[PDB]
């Protein structure tokens, strides 16, 4: 058995890439979604007995685990078109601190620098669906994965605020935290390459 | 007068891109190198009266300033070829914690998550030259900008340790911290685009 964590920020396609690859070497292969806010929190419980986390979140040293980049994935800051900040420009791209944000919450209650919300006006949720619902009701703005918002953007339901901050949306790194145990074994090195490849070329 | 900070991690070519662009709008334009470890520390002194910092370092809210991405730049983890970790593989890519690192030091004495060294065996320096000298004498490993190490890598003097962590070297974001003042003024928006462009296409 090889237990595996992908946070909800990882595209569902990546999910297809990994899985295929792993079954080449491994016979029993359990997959687990989690909020990016609960990813590292989860693996840090020994009982949870995770072997491989694929998450966007960062933490420097975690006991028992090693870290590496698999690649990068986009997110966008989004709101209801009519949302005050509709107009995108730089005075808006500091104003966010003043507006209500819909950020992911964490079991841990705590957030990492990467994921801790930016405004003091915050409304916590567990997953990006809860988030985007509330945001479609112009209740706030929020950041969510590219994949989640592709649809709604074309279907004029949602507007982007991010561009004048990071054009092309906000690239963030995808980490593989893995059990030190695996580092030696070629089984993993195999995954890692084959994974990495199909992620970039199709990233 | 427009005062400008580029940390030493920013390529010297970028330096050419910015400068040209700014003089189109601005008549007096002072440029200032700094260690990436002193970049933010500097601008936070009001006396230093900086208008625009181009740095790799991150900090969430800084009073008086706004933040945005200009792009991404590579670094590599390097050592003397004969260095114990020569062989690169995953057991090495946790072993770094155990080896002597040559990290940048800071006037501030303090380091940000991004820049704070990884091993407990550390030797501080001010600039990447000091660093790479010591590293060519296999005294430690260290991370340094792509530009700094291109030469020496081809000239077999230095070996890379990073690949199996982040292949293609370690992409990190380049930030523009800028005086809230500028946000309105088109002069800057101009810089920002024209800058951004020539940085990516030639990144
Ligand atoms: C980074 N990131 C992802 C990346 C990729 C996928 C999911 C997430 C994801 N999901 N949730 C959260 S929590 C919110 C937070 O605190 N971060 C945040 C970071 C950049 C922000 O951009 C701007 C834009 C204009 C002006 C100032 N900042 C705004 C907020 N962050 C996420
Ligand atoms: C990130 N970064 C730059 C980026 C671009 C340009 C300059 C620097 C630059 N200059 N100095 C410093 S200080 C050292 C530190 O604490 N960071 C660090 C970060 C990633 C590391 O990679 C690996 C590799 C294998 C296993 C584990 N980690 C190692 C150390 N960091 C820099």
Numbering used by the authors:
A (entry chain A), B (entry chain A): 94 to 296
Paper passage:
Pseudomonas aeruginosa has three highly interconnected QS systems: two N-acylhomoserine lactone (AHL)-dependent QS systems (the las and rhl systems) and the Pseudomonas Quinolone Signal (pqs) system which relies on alkylquinolone (AQ)-derived autoinducers. The P. aeruginosa pqs system uses the LysR-type transcriptional regulator PqsR (also known as MvfR), to control the expression of the pqsABCDE operon that encodes the enzymes required for the biosynthesis of 4-hydroxy-2-heptylquinoline (HHQ) which, upon the action of the mono-oxygenase PqsH, is converted to 2-heptyl-3-hydroxy-4-quinolone (PQS). PQS and HHQ interact with the C-terminal ligand binding domain of PqsR, resulting in a conformational change that leads to the activation of the pqs operon likely through the interaction of the helix-turn-helix DNA binding domain of this protein with the pqsA promoter. The pqs system is crucial for P. aeruginosa pathogenicity and has been regarded as a promising therapeutic target to alleviate antibiotic-resistant infections.
On the basis that the phenoxy group of M64 formed a π-π stacking interaction with the side chain of Tyr258 and combined with docking studies, it is suggested that introducing a 6-membered heterocycle would lead to enhanced π-π stacking with Tyr258 in the PqsR LBD. The resulting pyridine-2-yloxy analog 40 displayed similar activity compared to M64 at PAO1-L and an enhanced inhibition in PA14 with IC50 values of 0.25 ± 0.12 and 0.34 ± 0.03 μM, respectively. In order to determine the mode of binding of 40 to PqsR, the co-crystal structure with the PqsR LBD was obtained at resolution of 3.2 Å. The ligand-bound complex reveals that the tricyclic head group inserts deeply into the hydrophobic pocket, whilst the thioacetamide linker was positioned in the outer narrow U-shaped channel. In a similar fashion to M64, the sulfur atom on the linker allowed 40 to adopt the required conformation to fit into the binding pocket. The aromatic tail group points outside this pocket and shows a π-π stacking interaction with Tyr258 with a distance of 4.55 Å. Interestingly, compared to the reported crystal structure of M64, compound 40 did not establish a hydrogen bond with Gln194 but instead formed a hydrogen bond with Leu207. In addition, the pyridinyl side chain of compound 40 had an enhanced overlap with Tyr258 compared to the phenyl side chain of M64, which suggests that 40 could have an enhanced π-π stacking interaction with Tyr258. The crystal structure revealed the binding is dominated by the π-π stacking interaction with Tyr258 and the hydrogen bonding interaction between the amide linker of 40 and the side chain of Leu207, similar to that previously reported.
